[PDB]
Design a protein around this ligand. Structure first.
Ligand SMILES: O=C(O)[C@@](O)(COP(=O)(O)O)[C@H](O)[C@H](O)COP(=O)(O)O
Ligand SMILES: O=C(O)[C@@](O)(COP(=O)(O)O)[C@H](O)[C@H](O)COP(=O)(O)O
Ligand SMILES: [Mg+2]
Ligand SMILES: [Mg+2]
Ligand SMILES: [Mg+2]
Lengths: 139, 481, 481, 139, 139
């Protein structure tokens, strides 16, 4: 299956040229970019691993692309996402996040069902990749 | 007679009738205080009624006055509590309609109570014989009063953080037909729509609990469809479960049930009214629940320019009360929405402060006192072929809802959802690359380009390409540029 | 492709847009069922919109339809759930305004839920672009749906039995100034007015709890004034304690407090909304409390003939919900009230069944299913010199409220109350003797005769003899006689 | 003081001619008249004593006036009231009640105050005539 | 084990001739047929995957059998069921559902037991096939 977290995952995987145009847009709005990696695709896995610090004072989109491609060289197989942070009052939050790398094969998830009270089901979403192997060895 | 000897004999407090403008309710030299509540009314006096007297009558009968003088005023700090009409201007391109500004002392109002605010501002003055039409157009709610209110339970920022969705509008759809489906079939539609790409679906506003489907059947089947779709996609998913009910006890029962089974969101209808809405807004914050407000009944008083309440004021009251979403119009869909008015509503719901912007209907500068931002919802008769117009008019922080525009797809509900999501993402990607996407040549080509590799989008674009809703608006601006 | 092979290909359910009048929502031959909910709308179509298509669009989008065809209709008994517009008549003396009758299946609606009924009937259709104005004029609520509702907690009959007052209208007064008085001074006004002769006083609609007076101070001081007046007169007395508040929890707190100290009555504001109103209507029955409804905000949608909801429909919904009193107009006071419309409202609130009576705005025959009778309240800018007109227009079972008309008396509050009560009793006694009291010679002379031995009445008649409120009405009949 | 129960007690005591006109009105509406007596003026004393049965099948107002004047001859000093009953569906209740006789001197009431919880007062309305003497000798 | 969902699963696997007779019966009553697929056999897996839309307007049973055999050619190994829907008032529901295809080997389920309060057990029914492989690779 295709993990469709991120805001462009119903489009084909983005090229480096496409990614740089999104980075250029965010940086032209004064936003801070950062890069994050995970091999736990669970929808509630809030905190993917930081690749360094966010690039607060960086002005050249090529510098962001450089760090993305260093993360691609160094990280284990899995997912990488590109985030843009807006520190301004009223937001103080991420305003864009999209996937830049995904595994060639993602088995996805199944739905674990526990018999609750009455007819209620207690649900747990389980990742095939995570239940099988530890972090760094999942894909 | 002691009664005769102690009769009041001053000009202002001897018994009898005097004009409201002579009773203290008109003051052209009034210095507005930063703690005052301000109201702007569009007043159409009856023939022969002086426009300033009409404005003073609204100020008096919405604050402390009645129709004849009463000595009991003298037991109070009466000058402090009188509201003051302080400016009356002719409406542009009109000889008999006036804009009237009225200031109300902070202390007139119960803290954190929309029902008390509205009891004064709209309680009786719309029925006064001497005024043939009256519309509340805007209000300046001061920072000090706003801090007594919760504001949105969650707000746009925390909402996106709960959904882990940043960079595009959110997407949704109302289950159709409006009425008649069973709980099991409701869960089926929700499953298909979410699996196909939608962030949310929702109960129609009139889906509560009925012989064809009692609400617990709907809630449990929808939770199976939601969790199935989440496991199939790796995304947080949800559906607005409608907890609207006859009594507050039954509303809480449905809210607690939704929380107990793990729903991310519930929805309520505006017809439930202000006291229930404020109660559930507090509950939503205390129970980690997104709160979606459908504005059922709003157009009974918000449609016509001459009389009623402009929806921009409802936006303020509902953001104060603390709903997380409110329906706020589409411009290009089946329901009324002039773009200047709609852009004004969206700014009121989303910005941290407001500047005077008369073409948008923003008559007052207003700080939102860091109350959280309310998510507007664009819904009703829209389809993915209009995506460039929706992005242009409505911006990034909005839920775009496609009911018929999803379920009406000939190749099925999943295909309908996929077409909507591909169109949305392709439009946002192109916008961020710098495309002149609102252009009638560029926008539609972005969609056709994406359709070249997405069959469901090609089908949807061809099916609804001729559909538009072009009619003369009733709710229109008074100022241009 | 399986999705292409199984595409639906019938005229009605192939994907695409078709007119609502071809989707099942128009049927000139429809046979109305005694269990159907019927609505009558005044529809003003946009230029070029066919009047029958407009009626079918209201029927469709208030029942099961959306703007494009959806195959999911076929998972339901779709013909049963579709509403049917079944009659479209031109409005008399009008171009391009129509009366449209629409029938809704009983099963569309949640039992005992006004919020569900209104979610369908008024939810979205008032905002549709294709209709420039829309007004809900009347409804036929069938016997079978009515039996699911409580109706008035107490009702006129048990109310008079609790007060031990039979033979004349009841009498009341709003405390003035509207805002600013302390709890202690509020109790003083209530004491004086009740001692002087009034059956009730009442909190103004915007008196809830405020810096100048917190609500418990008002409640306790009023109970001292009420019990003092009761011991001074030998009568049951009361004052409508306003329990309107921001949240349902706070409303119940004020209601329970009122019960705990022995109040006969509480009051609520319509701005609290339908769900709070139904909750407190059940509470009132369960706690032996009279429930007074002030209709705050009603005129924002009830004033204009072209758009909104006629107040006569609000009368039905509130009698269904179960309030014991509702403000319903005066004809001759400061608030709008054409006499044909007002007489219609009073009949809807008070009768056991309704017959078609077009000059009164009664478009539907309707049995009230033995739901109790709701007490109308005539309030706003009236005075005792008008007593012959009030008795004529409004009948025996009404509360006549004189706020300024009591507290504005130059000889004090007791004198103002006495004047009102003498005028009321003298008028009723003369009426029962067969006087032609509505005649402009007879009625005013009855009052002057009573004033010969009642100084307070002589003073009141002289003070307000020149006061009238005569303006062109907005809410007027369409049929004569 | 003047007891102002009844619907005409802010007018002077009614003459027999005035009372007969009120009776004639009620009987012309098909209402049933009855006469009741008490010497407990308390506002919550719902059940005054019946003077015979209600006059359901009586058609002449003079017969009602006859019974009123027999009650006046026979009853102890105190209050008499005249009631009109509407048995119609939707009403089934009294629709008019007024005083026809009152004592020459009514001492009235005082307000007994018991200290409740907090600032609440528990009230009781006490009749001077009732606390002093038994039924039949209070006035 | 044999999954005994469906209404004929205690009889041998139905032949196409037997299925067509059941289809003809349902269509003669005006019912709408549809075909659904899953490889999650859990008893609480309500929503098997739709094979196109229900065949509302189809009148020839052979057309239903054609679609069944197209599903059999196209779907992964697992289960297919045939359903008949009655849209009439009072029902508005499925009135017949039976298995048309099942895997050659179904490992079945085990009962996971969590220690609840007191002596209570919190139960979860777990599928061997689902816990082992993602959708489309389970049989
Ligand atoms: O019932 C309806 O028509 C909808 O479900 C839309 O369905 P479609 O998506 O099929 O049109 C929404 O409630 C309206 O959009 C509300 O209007 P607004 O947002 O203006 O309050
Ligand atoms: O605030 C007011 O003006 C009143 O207290 C009247 O005071 P006065 O007796 O001093 O006029 C009533 O609330 C209005 O009559 C309500 O109008 P309606 O009954 O039409 O809803
Ligand atoms: Mg476990
Ligand atoms: Mg809807
Ligand atoms: Mg008032």
């Amino acid at each position: 299956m295709r993990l469709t977290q991120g805001c462009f995952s119903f489009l084909p995987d983005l090229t480096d040229q496409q990614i740089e145009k999104q980075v250029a847009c965010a940086m032209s709005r004064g936003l801070a970019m950062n890069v994050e990696w995970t091999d736990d695709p669970h929808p509630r896995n809030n905190y993917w691993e930081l690749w360094g610090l966010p690039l607060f004072d960086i002005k050249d989109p090529a510098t962001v692309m450089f760090e993305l491609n260093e993360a691609r060289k160094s990280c284990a197989a899995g997912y990488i996402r590109m985030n843009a942070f807006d520190a301004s009052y009223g937001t103080e939050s991420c305003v864009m996040s999209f996937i830049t790398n995904r595994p060639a094969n993602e088995p996805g998830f199944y739905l674990d069902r526990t018999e609750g009270v009455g007819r209620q089901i207690v649900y747990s979403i389980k990742s095939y990749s995570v239940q099988a192997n530890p972090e760094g060895s999942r894909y | 007679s002691v009664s005769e000897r102690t009769r009041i004999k001053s000009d202002r407090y001897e018994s009898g009738v005097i004009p409201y403008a002579k009773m203290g309710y008109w003051d052209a030299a009034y210095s507005v205080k930063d703690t005052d509540i301000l109201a702007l009314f569009r007043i159409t006096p009856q023939p022969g009624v002086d426009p300033v007297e009409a404005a003073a009558a609204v100020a008096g009968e919405s604050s402390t006055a009645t129709w004849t003088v009463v000595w009991t005023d003298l037991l109070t700090a009466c000058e402090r509590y009188r509201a003051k009409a302080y400016r009356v201007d002719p409406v542009p391109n009109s000889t008999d309609v006036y804009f009237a500004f009225i200031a109300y002392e902070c202390d007139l109002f119960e803290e954190a109570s929309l029902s008390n605010l509205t009891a004064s501002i709209i309680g009786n003055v719309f029925g006064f014989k001497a005024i043939s039409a009256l519309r509340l157009e805007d209000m300046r709610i001061p920072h000090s009063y706003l801090k007594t209110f919760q504001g949105p339970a969650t707000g746009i920022i925390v909402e996106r953080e709960r959904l882990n969705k940043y960079g595009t509008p959110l997407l949704g759809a109302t289950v159709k037909p409006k009425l008649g489906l069973s709980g099991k079939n409701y869960g089926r539609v929700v499953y298909e729509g979410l699996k196909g790409g939608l962030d949310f679906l929702k109960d129609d506003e009139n889906i509560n609990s009925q012989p064809f489907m009692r609400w617990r059947e709907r809630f449990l089947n929808c939770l199976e469809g939601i969790n199935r779709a989440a496991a199939a996609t790796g995304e947080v998913k949800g559906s607005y479960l409608n907890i609207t009910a006859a009594t507050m006890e039954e509303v809480y029962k449905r809210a607690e049930y939704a929380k107990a089974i793990g729903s991310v969101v519930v929805m309520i209808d505006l017809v439930m009214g202000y006291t229930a809405i404020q109660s559930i807004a507090y509950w939503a914050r205390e129970n980690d629940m997104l709160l979606h407000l459908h504005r059922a009944g709003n157009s009974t008083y918000a449609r016509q320019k001459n009389h009623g309440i402009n929806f921009r004021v409802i936006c303020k009251w509902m953001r104060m009360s603390g709903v997380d979403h409110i329906h706020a119009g589409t411009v290009v869909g089946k329901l009324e929405g002039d773009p200047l008015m709609i852009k004004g509503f969206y700014d009121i719901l989303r910005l941290t402060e407001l500047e005077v912007n008369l073409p948008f209907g923003i008559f007052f500068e207003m700080d939102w006192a860091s109350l959280r931002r309310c998510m507007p919802v664009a819904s009703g008769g829209i389809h993915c072929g209009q995506m460039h117009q929706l992005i242009h008019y409505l911006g990034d922080d909005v839920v775009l809802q496609f009911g018929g525009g999803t379920i009406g797809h000939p190749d099925g509900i999943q295909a309908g959802a996929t077409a909507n999501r591909v169109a949305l993402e392709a439009m946002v990607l192109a916008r961020n690359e710098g495309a002149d996407y609102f252009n009638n040549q560029v926008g539609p080509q972005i969609l056709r380009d994406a359709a070249k590799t997405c069959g469901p989008l090609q089908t949807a674009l061809d099916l609804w390409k001729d559909i538009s809703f072009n009619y003369t608006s009733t709710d229109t601006a008074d100022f241009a540029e």
